[model samples]
Target chain A: TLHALLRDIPAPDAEAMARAQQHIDGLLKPPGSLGRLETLAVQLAGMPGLNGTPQVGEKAVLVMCADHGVWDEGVAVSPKIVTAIQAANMTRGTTGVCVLAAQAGAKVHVIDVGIDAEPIPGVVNMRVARGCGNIAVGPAMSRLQAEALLLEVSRYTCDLAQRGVTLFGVGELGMANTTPAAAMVSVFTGSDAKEVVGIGANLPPSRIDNKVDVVRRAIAINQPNPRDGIDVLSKVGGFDLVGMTGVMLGAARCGLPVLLDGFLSYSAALAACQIAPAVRPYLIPSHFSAEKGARIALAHLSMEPYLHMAMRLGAGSGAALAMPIVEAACAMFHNMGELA
Target chain B: TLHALLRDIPAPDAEAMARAQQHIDGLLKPPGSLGRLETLAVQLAGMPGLNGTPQVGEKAVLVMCADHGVWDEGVAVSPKIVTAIQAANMTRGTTGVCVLAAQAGAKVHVIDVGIDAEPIPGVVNMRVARGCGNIAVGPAMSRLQAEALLLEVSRYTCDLAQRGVTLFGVGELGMANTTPAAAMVSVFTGSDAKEVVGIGANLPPSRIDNKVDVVRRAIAINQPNPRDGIDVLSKVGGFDLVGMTGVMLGAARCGLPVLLDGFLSYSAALAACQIAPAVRPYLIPSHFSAEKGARIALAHLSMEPYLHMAMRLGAGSGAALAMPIVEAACAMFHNMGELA
Candidate 1:
């Protein structure tokens, strides 16, 4: 979301630059305590022409709910219905991220980008396609379908931007997402394919091996453009990735922060950064996901996620948990004044 | 609680075996991905004559509540009532630890060793005295009162043991505890006084400095006998410290994992370890508290905490949150069969 927004940001003001520098210096921490946040605060001050911690307001966590055709190939532990069920459950406010979002004063918006099964009614339903095709044999989703999915995300984020949403968190809800996410992450990072893949939701050892094989084959067949992250995402990305990338672009256009959730978000963020580098300035990698691929994405992004609980639960939860701590960071800014 | 526990635990076992050696080899993780837990599990396996992760059953978390006389000297931002109020809040399921404990499924039992006000009604209240005497003027509690408090903790642990509790965690809730905890940590870890102390609850700089001075004075005046941690508790330890040390001893005697919470717990753990070196094997540092003294204590014990979220909340919460992960280790042990 931040990558596109930089295109229209006006030049920095002299007073804003001075306040930004002062805010960094005024940081209560002993010069280096906050590490990146201190540097980011200063940079943000100059980039956005804001003196203090920029108020990234009215967070809206957008979760792209979809299904992967690879379920038919026995990639994930659960059936495809679990995707729609989980998404509906998330929309109904029974999931972990939903509750965390509520606590963080962030609104939860679930969009059905694609699912073979019927989505629950009144779930902010925005179906982009029937569902992504099985990647085990071919491309996950058609290029046209992927582009449309991205448009759906862009539209949602643009609507939220109109509502004064300033921070958009990228979330994914699909049973076999890690399979595609890992495959895409491997392609981008050149990380070992075996190391990139893992058994999601306690799969049998054989199923785990099968998932890895699918990733290797998918990587072989669906070679994506290295420089064009959007193309890469469009090729192997599910509805979630396309939608998230669109949201990233939309948020950037609207001057909002795009907090990447974890591994899946890492893929989309990398894709967005490839399309436009400006988003890098506004994007904040919340935490280093325990997942190896996510860690590789963090490395590629050159970010040190603030926390590492070895948490691998997707749904943008790690980022939502990060919201409270981010507020704490601003709290220090509010409470601490310069000694001078 | 830790100090007393360390005085009692026998050298049951620490893995020291070959199947244990191979489990490390088979794990998808790097040989030392889990750091201390990997080593600790092996050591525990050897001690218990077990083959894998040691099961720490029904962990008992004791929140030792008291008022420091030094609090009267304006050494902390929070008033003395904050201790009783927070402790009372814990019983009523309000404070931080109470919320975290609810999530982690760890039973929290509040122990009021000393307090100025009466316990809130309908709360589990155990009062050793109407708070200790002014420590800045003299010793907080007499040697006899300290001993009695320790014994009370032992009794509590013993009673909990009958109901099948095997893991113990200790937390201290009292304004101005950071000062004393830092002093003890500095003394034990051979650290400088200034580096060991931090701004407690955003207290005034003078008060923070005075808090440090009081610690130095206590260390100089009491000249704590390193040989008898119990004796040291009587001379300089607050009433809650004595009780926590006793809980530590109780857990140690029962051959359970006595997880250290943070600086306050670490302070008592160091003393407990001094009294009983055998209990050293049973201790696990859950997470590093943001307090510098906590780092000192963890270093002194040669214990590596599993989490580090910059947690400075002194409610044994770090231990409670990390328990499920510990349980995960044991579950793997019980479930995974010999890889033939």
Candidate 2:
């Protein structure tokens, strides 16, 4: 089934990318002079993920809110209920991501992908489970269940894109989700668990080694196949992880660029990329996550983050904040005239 | 005169800085987890620059428009008239920085510091000179003129802060201004011309060597004194360069933070730091300039830029784009509740 999905993914438009870059180079600046912004313009311009022109003005941040059963493993600093509270706040435009998204003119959509709490008003209720299983102990979810949840969420994001959203920012709200993310990264990149784990939500230095062990245990128990992203998602990743992966695929299918948040979403992108390499062109790394594993994930993906404020608050805050920079890039090439 | 001005610069409050940082650390994230944003909050909260709060919602971009006598050196790619044209467009809210500032909810103010043109409607007429003298041949302006311009512009920006603008971004509009900026950096940092001169306005590689030579000639002719900022400004800096330095000093005087643009503005901040070390805490580096000299200038100030979009465009565009990130930092520390 993953192979079939991969087959449907088309390559980015090289000729169109060149055209957009040509226009950028013609915008009264030197070629490759704008740095990452130029690369972003070319990526957006060439990405079959975006519609005809890669416009960033009409953008929205998709905040996937869920909870991880791995919280029982004493992996993260925060409790599980914080996920529901933060997600509810996100829906009210009160969270950090909401605040920054409002400033960037990007709408925030909080999705209840698998939160442990009851459905909250304003949040899009799309729960795949009552939170994921403890990955440290065993598989997070079955392969069949993972594929089903991923496909459903993927269709939802694609539907939103079809209705006129051009840019998507994928963010997550899950306590202890980084454990699963680090596990998935270690499996996908063939790296050690210690290399892809960090003090999520500011855990004590004493607990960092525990986080590494939790990731190692989660991977060892699940033994997820790197070539089979669905297998990894089913075995170790949470619903939000799979859901974000689906959203990335959906954005790719609709030709819309997706702005990636820190490590958790990066892990999802890694999985999505494994499923379809074509998806890499559609994704933009917004910032460097304070999580130690983020650098490893970014390096594995060969993606360069544009901002490095040492932000670790997930929920798509970095991506939402980065929307303006992306819009400025388009504005630089599209609006600004050449030097006389 | 510069020494007298430096005496007025107050030291940042250590207690307030620690309190603010403590609060930032208490936010659901880890200690120093927000990185540059946390540093900004501490700087803003402790420094008299942000009135003890370090808030960022009320922001503005101060564009000091001027002309460079070094344009006569044939060092820059564009003609001198482009400076006035871009400044006028900035006032009209149609320039690159204007577009970004609008997006960031930051007001754009274009001040004619020393433009070689008549006062244009809507542009603030704060002319200090018709234009500076050719720096390659001699000092850009007399020391008295430079000090007077600095004092007047400094008061104007401080007045803006007193009027309730807590956040200011210092930008410039001056053709061949980077020549003076490089010259100032060379004199201030004891670096050679080639180390601090870059391809301004997309000059060809062949012209880069000439630009460096012009900067060397300007420094040789002016022989700016590193001990006296006014002497350096008068000898090797454009009116906008000194004007921005004054804005930074002025922002520090009134307890308001200032976001710095690329090479030219960085050169100004570097000079301001030399004049008053206390002003260093009030300054924020927005992005890395594509100019090679920016790295030297930033290193001289011991500051790091948050964004690396490879932007060479001036007019406060980079600063405007960076406002939201600064705002997000404030929001992260102030708005987000602690973990339960």
| lDDT tens digits by residue: candidate 1, A1-340 | 3333436534434465467667656532234334344454454444342223455567888888888877777887767777777776775665656755765678888878887787678677777666787777778766667666665577678688788776678888887888888877887777867877765555667777787888888767778767767667766667777777777777665555677787888888888777777667667666567665766788888876755545566676656655644444343445444433
- Chain A TM-score of model 1 comes to 0.89
Q: Which stretches of candidate 1 lie over 4 Å from their true place?
A: A1-18, A27-52, A337-340, B1-340
lDDT tens digits, residue span B235-311, model 1:
66777776677777776676666667777888888877777777577677776777766666777888767655566
Write model 2 residue lDDT over B1-340, tens digit each, in one string: 5556668777888988888877776765445655677788788787675657767647789899888777887887877777777777776666677777877788988999899988888988888778888898988888788888888888888878767788899888888888898888899889998888888777778888888888888887777889877788888898999889989988887767889999999889878987788888788889999998888888888888889788887878889888877787777667776644
Q: Which is the leading candidate under lDDT?
A: 2
Residue-level lDDT tens digits of model 2 in A1-340: 4456556766888888878876776654335556777778778887664644557647788888788889998987777788888787776655677777877777888888899988888889888788989998999888887888777777888788767778899988888888899888999998898788888777888988888888888888888999988899889899989989988988887777899989999999999988888888888989988888888899989988889778787878889878878887777667765544
DockQ of all candidate complexes: 0.06, 0.47
Q: Which candidate should be chosen as best, given TM-score against the real structure? A: 2
Considering the two chains of model 2, state its CAPRI-style docking category.
acceptable
How do the predictions measure up, each by TM-score? 0.61, 0.90
Kindly provide the TM-score of model 1 when superposed on the true structure, using C-alpha atoms.
0.61
